[PDB]
Amino acid sequence: GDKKEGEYIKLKVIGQDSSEIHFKVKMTTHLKKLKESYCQRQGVPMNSLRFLFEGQRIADNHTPKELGMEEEDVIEVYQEQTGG
Amino acid sequence: GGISEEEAAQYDRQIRLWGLEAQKRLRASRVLLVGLKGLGAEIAKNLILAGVKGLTMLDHEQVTPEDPGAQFLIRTGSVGRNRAEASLERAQNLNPMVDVKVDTEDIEKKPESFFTQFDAVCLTCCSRDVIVKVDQICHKNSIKFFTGDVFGYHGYTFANLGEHEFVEEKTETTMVKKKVVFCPVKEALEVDWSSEKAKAALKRTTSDYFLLQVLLKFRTDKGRDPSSDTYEEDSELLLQIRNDVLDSLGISPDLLPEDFVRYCFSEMAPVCAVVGGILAQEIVKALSQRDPPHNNFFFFDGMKGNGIVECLGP
Amino acid sequence: SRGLPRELAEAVAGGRVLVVGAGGIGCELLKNLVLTGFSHIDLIDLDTIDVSNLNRQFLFQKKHVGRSKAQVAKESVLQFYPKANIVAYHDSIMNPDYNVEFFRQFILVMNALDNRAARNHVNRMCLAADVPLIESGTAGYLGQVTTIKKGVTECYECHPKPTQRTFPGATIRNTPSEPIHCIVWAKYLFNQLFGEEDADQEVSPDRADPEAAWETKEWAKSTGYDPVKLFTKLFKDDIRYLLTMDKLWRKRKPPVPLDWAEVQSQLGLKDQQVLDVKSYARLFSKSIETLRVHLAEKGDGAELIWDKDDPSAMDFVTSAANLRMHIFSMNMKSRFDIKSMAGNIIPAIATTNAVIAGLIVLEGLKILSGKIDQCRTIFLNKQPNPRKKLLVPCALDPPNPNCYVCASKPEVTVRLNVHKVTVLTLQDKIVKEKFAMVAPDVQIEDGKGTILISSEEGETEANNHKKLSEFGIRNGSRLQADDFLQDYTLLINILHSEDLGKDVEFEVVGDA
Ligand SMILES: Nc1ncnc2c1ncn2[C@@H]1O[C@H](COP(=O)(O)OP(=O)(O)OP(=O)(O)O)[C@@H](O)[C@H]1O
Ligand SMILES: [Mg+2]
Numbered sequence: 001g002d003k004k005e006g007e008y009i010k011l012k013v014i015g016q017d018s019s020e021i022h023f024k025v026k027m028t029t030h031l032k033k034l035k036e037s038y039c040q041r042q043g044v045p046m047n048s049l050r051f052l053f054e055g056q057r058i059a060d061n062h063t064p065k066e067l068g069m070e071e072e073d074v075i076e077v078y079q080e081q082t083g084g
Numbered sequence: 085g086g087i088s089e090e091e092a093a094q095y096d097r098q099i100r101l102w103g104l105e106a107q108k109r110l111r112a113s114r115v116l117l118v119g120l121k122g123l124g125a126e127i128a129k130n131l132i133l134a135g136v137k138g139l140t141m142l143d144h145e146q147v148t149p150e151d152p153g154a155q156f157l158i159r160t161g162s163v164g165r166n167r168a169e170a171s172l173e174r175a176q177n178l179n180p181m182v183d184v185k186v187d188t189e190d191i192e193k194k195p196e197s198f199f200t201q202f203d204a205v206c207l208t209c210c211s212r213d214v215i216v217k218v219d220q221i222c223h224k225n226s227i228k229f230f231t232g233d234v235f236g237y238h239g240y241t242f243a244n245l246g247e248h249e250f251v252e253e254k255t256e257t258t259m260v261k262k263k264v265v266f267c268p269v270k271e272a273l274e275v276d277w278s279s280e281k282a283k284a285a286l287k288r289t290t291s292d293y294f295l296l297q298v299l300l301k302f303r304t305d306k307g308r309d310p311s312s313d314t315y316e317e318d319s320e321l322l323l324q325i326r327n328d329v330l331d332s333l334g335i336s337p338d339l340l341p342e343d344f345v346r347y348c349f350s351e352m353a354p355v356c357a358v359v360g361g362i363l364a365q366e367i368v369k370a371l372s373q374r375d376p377p378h379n380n381f382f383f384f385d386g387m388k389g390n391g392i393v394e395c396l397g398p
Numbered sequence: 399s400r401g402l403p404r405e406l407a408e409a410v411a412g413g414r415v416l417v418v419g420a421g422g423i424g425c426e427l428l429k430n431l432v433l434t435g436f437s438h439i440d441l442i443d444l445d446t447i448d449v450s451n452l453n454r455q456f457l458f459q460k461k462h463v464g465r466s467k468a469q470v471a472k473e474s475v476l477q478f479y480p481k482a483n484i485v486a487y488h489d490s491i492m493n494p495d496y497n498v499e500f501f502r503q504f505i506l507v508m509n510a511l512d513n514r515a516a517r518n519h520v521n522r523m524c525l526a527a528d529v530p531l532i533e534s535g536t537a538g539y540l541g542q543v544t545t546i547k548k549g550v551t552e553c554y555e556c557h558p559k560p561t562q563r564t565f566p567g568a569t570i571r572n573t574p575s576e577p578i579h580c581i582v583w584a585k586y587l588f589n590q591l592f593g594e595e596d597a598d599q600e601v602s603p604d605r606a607d608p609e610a611a612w613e614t615k616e617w618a619k620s621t622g623y624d625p626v627k628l629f630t631k632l633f634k635d636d637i638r639y640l641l642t643m644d645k646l647w648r649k650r651k652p653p654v655p656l657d658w659a660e661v662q663s664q665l666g667l668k669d670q671q672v673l674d675v676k677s678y679a680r681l682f683s684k685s686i687e688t689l690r691v692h693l694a695e696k697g698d699g700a701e702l703i704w705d706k707d708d709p710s711a712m713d714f715v716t717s718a719a720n721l722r723m724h725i726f727s728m729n730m731k732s733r734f735d736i737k738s739m740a741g742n743i744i745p746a747i748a749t750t751n752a753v754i755a756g757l758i759v760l761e762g763l764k765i766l767s768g769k770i771d772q773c774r775t776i777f778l779n780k781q782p783n784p785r786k787k788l789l790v791p792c793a794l795d796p797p798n799p800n801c802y803v804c805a806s807k808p809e810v811t812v813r814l815n816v817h818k819v820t821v822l823t824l825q826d827k828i829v830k831e832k833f834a835m836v837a838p839d840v841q842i843e844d845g846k847g848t849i850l851i852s853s854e855e856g857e858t859e860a861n862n863h864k865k866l867s868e869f870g871i872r873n874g875s876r877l878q879a880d881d882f883l884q885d886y887t888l889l890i891n892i893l894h895s896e897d898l899g900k901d902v903e904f905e906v907v908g909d910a
């Protein structure tokens with residue numbers, strides 16, 4: 001429901017507050033663009049977010065294909081809380 | 085508001101989270117907590133701070149040594165007294181606004197009537213028999229039921245809120261009404277691994293569930309939980325119980341690695357803290373009727389640092 | 399304490415631990431550290447007990463309000479462990495008295511801070527001392543834990559995070575989109591009327607704005623500080639002149655000027671219910687007047703500092719913000735809400751902290767068992783992720799080979815015109831801002847090693863106005879920024895570039 005570059009699969013990034021933002025990324029693209037697209041939209045400091053997929057951290061250079069991301073795969077997002 | 089002006093400042097930070105109405109419902113709830121050990125104290129303190137109408141700490145057991153360096157609600161010199169009373173004073177100071185009471189009778193002898201005076205019951209250190217018994221009485225009397233313990237680097241929390249209806253929030257903010265259904269603890273502890281809905285999940289099921297089984301049996305067959313003072317003796321017996329219990333459910337004992345006996349003894353403070361806060365937060369959600377409760381089991385393993393929410397029973 | 403088991407319990411007893419912060423996480427942490435065995439612990443905090451901290455920080459009681467956290471903390475703790483060997487420092491951790499040698503004392507360091515600034519300073523100190531650092535944080539129901547070890551894992555700055563929330567003077571003085579833009583607008587206005595006049599924190603519409611390529615203590619005192627006079631200049635005259643810039647107003651909803659005359663023609667918590675425009679306009683006037691009456695008591699020449707807990711101050715910002723929002727078709731918000739935003743209050747509860755602290759000790763036990771590679775960043779969710787996990791554990795990553803801090807020989811290239819950029823823009827918009835350095839000690843890495851900026855006052859004061867070229871700084875020059883307290887050095891490669899851009903003083907090589 002909100003693509004980035006190419007088109008092939010629709011991922012769904014869910015946060016800790018149960019929020020969702022479906023994405024449509026090019027099967028072979030630096031996922032670092034979704035992270036950017038995300039924090040840009042959600043309006044939160046990039047470096048304060050940590051995206052995860054099935055346990056593994058999504059490296060800026062990672063891509064759906066190299067990770068085996070299909071259709072409807074859910075990407076988890078976590079933010080660093082700062083309250084002590 | 086409808087609450088003390090003072091209370092408005094004391095609970096300000098938590099009010100800014102779950103809202104004034106939630107705090108009200110919490111301010112109007114009485115909780116029964118049995119077993120005043122590590123998990124016990126942690127739980128007590130979390131509720132007393134939260135601001136419940138009142139909390140009753142039940143425990144008929146005496147304050148055996150080795151408690152001071154494990155329980156912060158007791159005085160350095162109280163060895164030989166009632167575990168509950170000994171905690172009274174300190175626990176009470178945690179928050180005057182709350183009326184902390186102390187009972188000293190074996191939870192078993194208690195009559196169904198005694199339980200109807202509370203909004204939620206939370207057991208600890210109790211035997212399965214006592215757990216099922218109380219869980220059953222609460223159900224018939226429409227009472228939120230919680231239980232949980234800790235062993236080594238592991239710990240668990242169970243919940244049975246029956247026909248629990250609550251309110252979440254997804255958006256300006258808009259509340260939504262949702263309903264969830266829990267099951268008896270007996271049904272949760274006695275699952276049929278033959279069913280297709282079972283065998284087809286046993287894989288993704290944390291073994292901690294079977295860990296609880298084994299240990300529960302231990303507490304039953306014996307009259308205490310495993311001890312370092314008797315590691316070898318207890319370790320031998322444990323592995324055995326693993327085989328007995330598991331050869332019944334219809335699953336291989338492999339599901340519970342034999343090394344499980346290495347990390348499940350005594351009470352680890354950090355564990356009590358973790359488990360306690362989780363349990364105590366579930367109690368608050370159920371009492372304030374705000375947010376989705378964890379249906380219905382929660383397993384913590386300090387070794388790997390995993391907190392899994394399982395749903396067994398239905 | 400007695401069963402946990404041998405080799406481990408040995409270090410837990412003898413080892414000396416340091417805990418930074420005694421608030422929510424802190425208290426829970428102490429309780430555990432002690433109960434778990436650790437008997438030699440050093441506490442440090444720079445705040446006093448508040449009645450609001452009474453819902454989680456169980457080491458404090460009503461009777462302790464106003465006292466020192468660290469102080470009371472130690473007392474309370476020594477109650478259920480008289481044999482505890484604690485030492486508490488009622489003072490900031492940023493204090494220069496706590497140098498590397500101090501930090502190298504401990505076998506483990508744990509943070510319980512509530513702001514990046516501190517977390518940064520502590521992050522570097524532990525690197526300098528090369529001592530395990532367990533970093534944590536919480537917020538409402540969420541929170542996380544992680545480990546940091548020089549050379550081994552990433553530091554708290556391998557992926558730099560803001561210490562504060564900066565906002566562009568554009569959307570603040572010309573195009574406010576979020577309610578927060580008005581609240582901030584209100585704060586500047588507060589610091590422009592009763593506080594220190596901050597040139598950057600203006601309030602009037604900006605003419606030199608990109609969007610609209612055009613062709614206030616002044617007005618305040620010149621009008622004798624009259625709410626009415628002011629109201630019409632802040633919510634009428636200025637907005638009117640704002641519309642004059644039809645450039646910035648093309649497709650975006652235009653503001654609606656107000657008028658003191660027209661305006662005067664109309665169960666949660668007291669502060670939870672919103673009021674009507676007029677009600678706020680009056681509060682706007684009532685607050686201002688009350689504020690200046692208080693500022694009239696504070697000696698002669700003393701300014702005012704905005705505090706979320708100062709009634710008159712809260713009234714002003716609340717009112718000023720709402721009036722500002724109304725003008726921009728944004729829906730007004732209650733005092734309770736504006737208080738949280740203007741005061742960045744962080745919703746805290748006991749359970750959430752109680753969890754984190756438990757996890758902290760667990761990672762510490764691992765580290766002391768020489769099982770560091772088993773440590774991992776853990777996240778506490780509100781609702782089980784798709785894998786049924788409420789506590790998400792993920793591995794620690796290796797040091798970032800391009801981190802500006804933990805790297806072996808931190809170095810970076812700064813592109814900028816060496817003829818226009820003043821020595822101050824360096825020590826402020828670059829060394830302190832970007833690279834994140836509070837106590838800079840820049841110098842030219844040349845044959846003589848010229849001192850351009852010194853941390854100590856009364857030395858490099860007469861240079862902030864001079865041009866970098868004036869010190870012979872040129873294309874290819876190499877500067878050395880230092881922060882000795884933290885034993886941090888950062889080589890800065892200057893790359894001269896006149897035709898760089900507009901309003902872009904400098905630019906680091908590696909950003910977009
Ligand atoms: N630089 C620092 N040096 C020492 N202690 C610090 C430093 N920065 C923050 N702290 C301490 O960190 C702790 C943060 O915990 P916490 O957020 O619960 O406290 P708080 O100020 O009462 O929070 P709040 O007021 O927002 O409810 C406080 O006890 C505070 O004094
Ligand atoms: Mg704070």
Ligand SMILES: [Zn+2]
Pocket residue numbers: 552553554555556797798801802803804805
């Ligand atoms: Zn680094």
